[PDB]
Amino acid sequence: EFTAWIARENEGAIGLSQETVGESFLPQGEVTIQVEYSSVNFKDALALTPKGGVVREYPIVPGIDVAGTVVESQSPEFSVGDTVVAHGYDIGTARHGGYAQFARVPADWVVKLDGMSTRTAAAIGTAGFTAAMSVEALQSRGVEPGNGPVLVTGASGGVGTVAVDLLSAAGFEVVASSGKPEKAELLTQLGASKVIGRLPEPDTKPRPLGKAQWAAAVDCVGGATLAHVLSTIEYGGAVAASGLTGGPKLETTVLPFILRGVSLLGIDSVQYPIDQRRRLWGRLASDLAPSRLESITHDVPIADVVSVIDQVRAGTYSGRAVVAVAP
Amino acid sequence: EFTAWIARENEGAIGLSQETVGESFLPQGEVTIQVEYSSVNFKDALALTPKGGVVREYPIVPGIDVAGTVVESQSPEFSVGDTVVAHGYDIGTARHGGYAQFARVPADWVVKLDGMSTRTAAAIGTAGFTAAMSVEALQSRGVEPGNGPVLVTGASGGVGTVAVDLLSAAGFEVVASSGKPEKAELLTQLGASKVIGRLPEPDTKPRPLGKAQWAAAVDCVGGATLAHVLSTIEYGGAVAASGLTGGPKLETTVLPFILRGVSLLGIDSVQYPIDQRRRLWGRLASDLAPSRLESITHDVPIADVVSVIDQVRAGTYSGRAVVAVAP
Ligand SMILES: [Cl-]
C-alpha cells in the first residue's frame, strides 16, 4: 500500500484527497513505476475544476506527466531500475497518473530515459514535448532561420514558453505574442526578440490576405488569433496549431493556402505514436533540449500541490512547476 | 511578324481574335520560345469570360501553359534548340501566354525539358503539375498507401483527374468525388477505386469532428467541401488544398488539427520557386509521370480552340485538350 492524491467529486465540487491505497487501485499495465516527479499543467488544474471538461469520470489520480523508476515490468523492453517518462494517452485523464507514489501503464506508452534525469523529463513534460513537436512540424515544411520572424502566440503558457526557447536557440528571430504584459521579461529571458500584445490588434480590419509579416508561427490560441496569423504568414510559411483558448471555431479563407502556399500543421501530443514519441524524447535529451527552462523551474513538494494548481488555474503562477513526489 | 490569338474586350464581351503581330508586341524576357503546344484549362476559359477574374487587363494572349523550342536566348542557361515548358507567374494572365506562335519569358520562369516532349509537357501542364505538388505535399506529411482511402474532390477537373492517376498508380485507394456522374467511367479508367458524388452529402450533420473516413485528401473545391473533408480526415492525415470553386471563405474548426493531428497544405503552382519547379518537372518525366493521361488527351488545332474553350467553360468537355500552336 502507498499514498495517492486522489481527485473526488462530491455534490458538484472537486477535491484532492491524500489517501493510503493498495495495489488493486492502480489501473492495468505491464509497467509499474515509482513516481519520482510530476508537473502542474493547466490541464491538471482543469482536472481539479468543476466544469473542466478534462476528466471522463472521477475518482482519478491527476497528473498527465509521469517520470520515475520502473519497479516491476512484465515487458522485455523495460527492466527494473530503468528510468522512464510516461505521458499522453489516457494518463491523468481517464486513468490514474503522476500524483501518486506509484503508477502503472502499458509498455506501449512508456519512454525510456537515457541521459535525461527524471526531474528534467517532468520539467519538460507534455508542454515542452508539444513545443518540440511544433518546432519539428515547422521545420518539416521548410521553415529555416533568416527568412523573417517566427511568431509564438499565447506565448506565456507552457507550450509557448518552451517554443520561444527552442526557436531562439535554433537561431530564429522569435516574436512572442501575449495578453499578459507582466510576462514580457520572462519571454525575453527565454529568447524573444520582441514581445507584443494579443492579435489581431483591435484596430485591424481582417483581410483574406493581410500584410505578410511572419515566416512561420507556433499558435497556442486558436480562434480569431489563428485566423489573423494565417492571413499574415509569408509565402511558403507554416503554422503549427497546438492549442485552444476560447471556442474551437475557425473562420478563415483558403487564400493563404492556395495563393501563398501556407501550411497549417495540427499538433497532438496525446495520441502521438509511441515510436515517434520515443524518438522525439531523444531529441529533447540532445539537440532539442530547452536550455533556459531550468531558470524558470520551481520545485513543488507533492503535499503543497493544491496551492500551485490554484494559481495556475487563476493564471497568476510564474514559471514552470515540477512536482516532487518521491525523490 | 507572326500570328497571335488575342483576347479583347468589346462592349462587355470577350472574344479571341486571330491577328498578325510583330516582335514589339511580345513582353520582356530573356528567352524567346517558338510555341509548339499549349492547353485549355478552366482558368484559360475564364480569361476568355466577361467577369472571369483571371486577367489583369486586356488585350492579352491567353494560355497559361507554354511548351516549345527556344529560338533566342539572352541567357547562358538556355540555348537555341532547347525544348522548354513555361507556366505560372504572369503567363497567360498578366502577360502574353501560349496561344501565339511565339512567346517571350524571363529565363528564371523557364523549365528545360530533357526526356519529355513539348506535347507531353503541355498535356500535363499546370493542372498536372499542381496534382504532382499535391501528391508530394501529402507524402511530406507521412501519407502512405494501405491504411485507408484517399479522397480527391472536384475529381473530374484538370487537377483531380491527374491526381487520381498519380495516386492510384502509387498504390493508393482513391475515391473520386465528382459532381458530374457522366464522368465516372473516365475517372475509373484513370484508377479511381470508387466514384462518388459531391461532398458533403445532404443528409450528413456538419460536425467539428465527423466520421474519420479518409487517410488524406486532395481538395480542388474549397469552401464547405473543404470544411467537410477536414472534419473527416483520420488521425494524422493530411489535406492538399489547391482549388477554389465557391467563395474563398472557409468556416471550420481547429479540432481536426489539435485533436486529430491533421495537416492542411496549401498548393500554389503559380509562384512556386523555379528551383523546386524544375526538380518537380524532372519527376513528372520519371517517377511521377501520369501513366494514363495520354488515353484521355485530345489534340486541338489552335484554329479550333474556341470550340473547346466554350465546352470547358460549360463543364461539358471530356478529357484533356492539348493545343497544337505550331504545325
Ligand atoms: Cl499568453
| CB–CB contact A260 B266 (8 Å) | yes
**Angstrom distance (rounded) from CA A102 to CA A100:** 5
Give the dihedral of Cα atoms B7, B70, B294, B314; nearest 10 deg.
-10
Q: Do B253 and A249 touch (CB under 8 A)?
A: yes
What's the rounded Cα separation, in Å, for the pair A190 and A184? 10
Q: Is the separation of the CB atoms in B48 and B37 below 8 Å? A: no
- Residue (of B114, B111, B94, B91) closest to B103 by Cα position: B91
- Could you tell me the residue ranges of all domains in chain A? 1-126+292-327, 127-291
SS3 B230: helix
What Å resolution does this PDB entry report? 2.0
Report helix angle B158-169 to B118-140, nearest 10. Answer: 70
Instruction: Dig out the grid coordinates for A284 from the structure.
Output: 529533447
The listed CATH number (3.40.50.720, 3.90.180.10, 1.10.510.10, 1.20.1530.20) that belongs to domain B1-126+292-327? 3.90.180.10
Give the residue on A whose Cα is nearest the Cα of B249.
Answer: A253
Domain B127-291, CATH class in plain words = alpha beta
CA distances from B24 to A1, A78, B27, B38 (A): 92, 77, 8, 22
> CB distance from A279 to chain B under 8 Å?
no
First to last CA, chain B: 17
| Contact: A241, B254; criterion CB under 8 Å | yes
Residue partners of A185: CB distance under 8 A and separation at least 6: none
Q: Which member of B222, B235, B271 has the closest CB to residue A254? A: B222
What cell numbers appear for A111 in the block?
Answer: 519512454
Determination method here?
X-ray
Instruction: Report CA(A190)–ligand 1 centroid distance (Å).
Output: 14
Helices (H), chain A: 42-46, 118-140, 158-169, 184-189, 223-232, 255-258, 274-285, 305-314
Question: In chain B, which residues have their Cβ closer than 8 Å to the Cβ of A262?
Answer: 266
Smallest CA–CA distance from B242 into chain A, residue:
A258
At A165, the amino acid letter reads D
Chain centroid, CA A78 distance in Å:
25
What the block records as the C-alpha cell of B43 is 482558368
Distance CA(A5)–CA(A22), nearest Å, equals 13
Burial class of A103 by CB neighbour count within 10 A (0 to 12, 13 to 18, 19+):
buried
Cα-based torsion angle of the residue sequence B150, B152, B158, B162 in order, rounded to the nearest 10 degrees: 10
Within a 10 A sphere around the Cβ of A199, how many other Cβ atoms? 20
Cβ atoms of B144 and B172 closer than 8 Å: no
Interface of A with B in 201-230 (CB under 8 A): 208, 222-223, 226
Q: Hey, what's the cell of A220?
A: 497556442
Ligand 1 mean position to A313 CA, how many Å? 14
Q: Write B20-26 long-range contacts (CB < 8 A, 24+).
A: B21/B100, B25/B96, B26/B96, B26/B102, B26/B103, B26/B104
Check if A88 contacts B (Cβ < 8 Å).
no
In contact, B229 and B153? CB cutoff 8 Å: yes
